[PDB]
């Protein structure tokens, strides 16, 4: 679920997804259009694409299970579809952590739609 995604971001990236990634660039936040603007933005683009490929369950409300072992986030459960949702969120959380070096809210927060033309929308 999205609440779990927020949890993973805070666990892995040690940041609040709501407060740092809810309206960044063209893709960080609900939906998206145009070109991913930077590393962080592409992380979001990929996450959106990942959710878009999940069939059989709901990435927004379904709850998945995970544990922490060998210093990582391990997605589990007996439901392959829910495990897939967890993998999407896990990958995005790590991506945000790994690209904190270039995170730039001053340039990319509330970027604007004109800067994210529908004609430049990169396909998954």
From Swiss-Prot:
UniProt subcellular location: Secreted
Matching Gene3D superfamilies: Phospholipase A2 domain
UniProt-listed InterPro entries: PLipase_A2 (IPR001211), PLipase_A2_Asp_AS (IPR033112), PLipase_A2_dom (IPR016090), PLipase_A2_dom_sf (IPR036444), PLipase_A2_His_AS (IPR033113)
The protein's assembly and partners: Monomer.
Assigned EC number: 3.1.1.4
Protein name: Acidic phospholipase A2
Primary enzyme class: hydrolase
GO BP annotations, alphabetical order: arachidonate secretion; lipid catabolic process; negative regulation of T cell proliferation; phospholipid metabolic process
Keyword flag Lipid metabolism: yes
Keyword Repeat: no
Reactions catalysed, as given in the entry: a 1,2-diacyl-sn-glycero-3-phosphocholine + H2O = a 1-acyl-sn-glycero-3-phosphocholine + a fatty acid + H(+)
SS bond partners: 26-116, 28-44, 43-95, 49-124, 50-88, 57-81, 75-86
One MF term in the entry's GO annotations: calcium-dependent phospholipase A2 activity
PANTHER family, per database record: PHOSPHOLIPASE A2 FAMILY MEMBER, PHOSPHOLIPASE A2, MEMBRANE ASSOCIATED
Keyword terms of this UniProt record: Blood coagulation cascade inhibiting toxin, Calcium, Disulfide bond, Hemostasis impairing toxin, Hydrolase, Lipid degradation, Lipid metabolism, Metal-binding, Pharmaceutical, Platelet aggregation inhibiting toxin, Secreted, Toxin
Species in which this protein is naturally found: Gloydius halys
Function: Snake venom phospholipase A2 (PLA2) that acts in vivo as an anti-thrombotic agent. Inhibits platelet aggregation induced by ADP, arachidonic acid, and thrombin. PLA2 catalyzes the calcium-dependent hydrolysis of the 2-acyl groups in 3-sn-phosphoglycerides.
Matches recorded under CDD domains: PLA2c (cd00125)
Cofactor requirements of the protein: Ca(2+)
Binding, Ca(2+): 27, 29, 31, 48
